[PDB]
Amino acid sequence: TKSDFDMIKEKEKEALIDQAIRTALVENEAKTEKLDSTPEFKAMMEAVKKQALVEFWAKKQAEEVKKVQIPEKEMQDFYNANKDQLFVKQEAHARHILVKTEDEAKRIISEIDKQPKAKKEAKFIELANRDTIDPNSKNAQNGGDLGKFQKNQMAPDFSKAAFALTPGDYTKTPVKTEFGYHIIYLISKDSPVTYTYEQAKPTIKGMLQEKLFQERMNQRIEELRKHAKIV
Amino acid sequence: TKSDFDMIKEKEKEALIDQAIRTALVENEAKTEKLDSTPEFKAMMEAVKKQALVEFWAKKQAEEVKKVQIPEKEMQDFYNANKDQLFVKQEAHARHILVKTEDEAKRIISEIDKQPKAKKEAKFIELANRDTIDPNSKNAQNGGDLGKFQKNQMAPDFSKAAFALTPGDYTKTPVKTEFGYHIIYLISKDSPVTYTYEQAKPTIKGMLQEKLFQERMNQRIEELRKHAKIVI
Numbered sequence A: 001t002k003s004d005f006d007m008i009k010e011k012e013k014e015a016l017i018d019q020a021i022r023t024a025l026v027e028n029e030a031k032t033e034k035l036d037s038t039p040e041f042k043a044m045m046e047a048v049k050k051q052a053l054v055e056f057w058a059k060k061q062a063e064e065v066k067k068v069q070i071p072e073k074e075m076q077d078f079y080n081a082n083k084d085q086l087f088v089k090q091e092a093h094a095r096h097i098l099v100k101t102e103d104e105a106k107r108i109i110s111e112i113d114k115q116p117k118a119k120k121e122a123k124f125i126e127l128a129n130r131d132t133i134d135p136n137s138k139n140a141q142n143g144g145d146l147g148k149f150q151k152n153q154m155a156p157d158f159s160k161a162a163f164a165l166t167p168g169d170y171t172k173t174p175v176k177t178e179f180g181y182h183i184i185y186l187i188s189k190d191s192p193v194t195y196t197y198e199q200a201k202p203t204i205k206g207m208l209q210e211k212l213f214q215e216r217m218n219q220r221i222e223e224l225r226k227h228a229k230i231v
Numbered sequence B: 001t002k003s004d005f006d007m008i009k010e011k012e013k014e015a016l017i018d019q020a021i022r023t024a025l026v027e028n029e030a031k032t033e034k035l036d037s038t039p040e041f042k043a044m045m046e047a048v049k050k051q052a053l054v055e056f057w058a059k060k061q062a063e064e065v066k067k068v069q070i071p072e073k074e075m076q077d078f079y080n081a082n083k084d085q086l087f088v089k090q091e092a093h094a095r096h097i098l099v100k101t102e103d104e105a106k107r108i109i110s111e112i113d114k115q116p117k118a119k120k121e122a123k124f125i126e127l128a129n130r131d132t133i134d135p136n137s138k139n140a141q142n143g144g145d146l147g148k149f150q151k152n153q154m155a156p157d158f159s160k161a162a163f164a165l166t167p168g169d170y171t172k173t174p175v176k177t178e179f180g181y182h183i184i185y186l187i188s189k190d191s192p193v194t195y196t197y198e199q200a201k202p203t204i205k206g207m208l209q210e211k212l213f214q215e216r217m218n219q220r221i222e223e224l225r226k227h228a229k230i231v232i
């Protein structure tokens, strides 16, 4: 149906057409008022245009990369070289305590060292509630509990230390993070299980295509630079 | 600085200009490749422009509305007619049970009814883990626990019944909501405090200005309808 000039294509259908009509009426009025000729409007339209030109070009390059056949050896070599970083699933449960100075940390660790086995985690819980400067933990008073997490979910040096422990054990030397020094207690830790090559393969193809696509974009962009007047 | 013809408008800045340059290069190339001449691109631009026309029109109406001073008696009559519904602060802690059909709810309530008070809430908790159709509640298995909430956060019919209970008491007849039928147990409930007009003033003005802005859009749109050739 038609609102003045503009074209639009059960009983609910009518209500929809009513909304469409109202919208066309506002569009027409906005054009009549020349709101698309305000600088703000023009600026916004060109930002959108630039963004969309860049994204369509990207899609074009991606569609050309998706055509390239990735060799089996390249996916198997990627699997062998990156499985232990990318395809091992291992959930840990741990508590931590964060402090300002490596000395404070050392003293806390000393306070745990002297506990009987039965009282180790309780002591840790108490020291976390008393001394942590992790604001989340300090506020929750949950004994420095981090819940369950993967190695690729915490900062690398924290994750390494946590996963290197065996359950029931804590770090005997403080751990350096930018937030300060951590003492970590491991409650539990699953045995690592790696995804098999056949299970990782589609993911691997996608990661190698992503790699080709980014290299291709950077190659193309450098060719465009060498043929452009930049000042 | 300038990329071919295109124009661009200390170490973060360097990276910024570089990234901007790369983007201009891509924009120019996309133009060279005539990606802006495809049906898809023109369609997208047309949609974005239409949307933005409507938004700028609205924004304009809002800018004209914000100039209007809302009369004091309007805000005071708003306050007086709507204070007990909108401006009472009352925090509650309660447990609830949602069911599809009223009969299930009644059986559940009777199941609580046959319990001594000391085992009533444990019974409520079991019943909540078993028969609730709140998926959040069903998944947490926390006994229909809702934490703390204000009186203006729940469905009206929920809040009236939950807030009419005394602490430790539960609803003796199920409560009708669109999600089904409810049974409520009241753990805690603060004493109601109604906000003063002086405290309600800034929030109220924002509500009444909103009321006008929506009324003003409808008024104008209806006039726009009478001066247009609509054909169906």
Ligand SMILES: O=C(O)c1cc2ccccc2[nH]1
Pocket: A096, A098, A133, A134, A135, A146, A154, A155, A158, A177, A179
């Ligand atoms: O900001 C903090 O307190 C904090 C950092 C951090 C890093 C890894 C694990 C736990 C953590 N907590």
Ligand SMILES: O=C(O)c1cc2ccccc2[nH]1
Pocket: B096, B098, B133, B134, B135, B146, B154, B155, B158, B177, B179
């Ligand atoms: O959708 C639901 O299950 C649900 C409705 C509702 C109303 C008040 C309090 C809690 C509630 N939960």
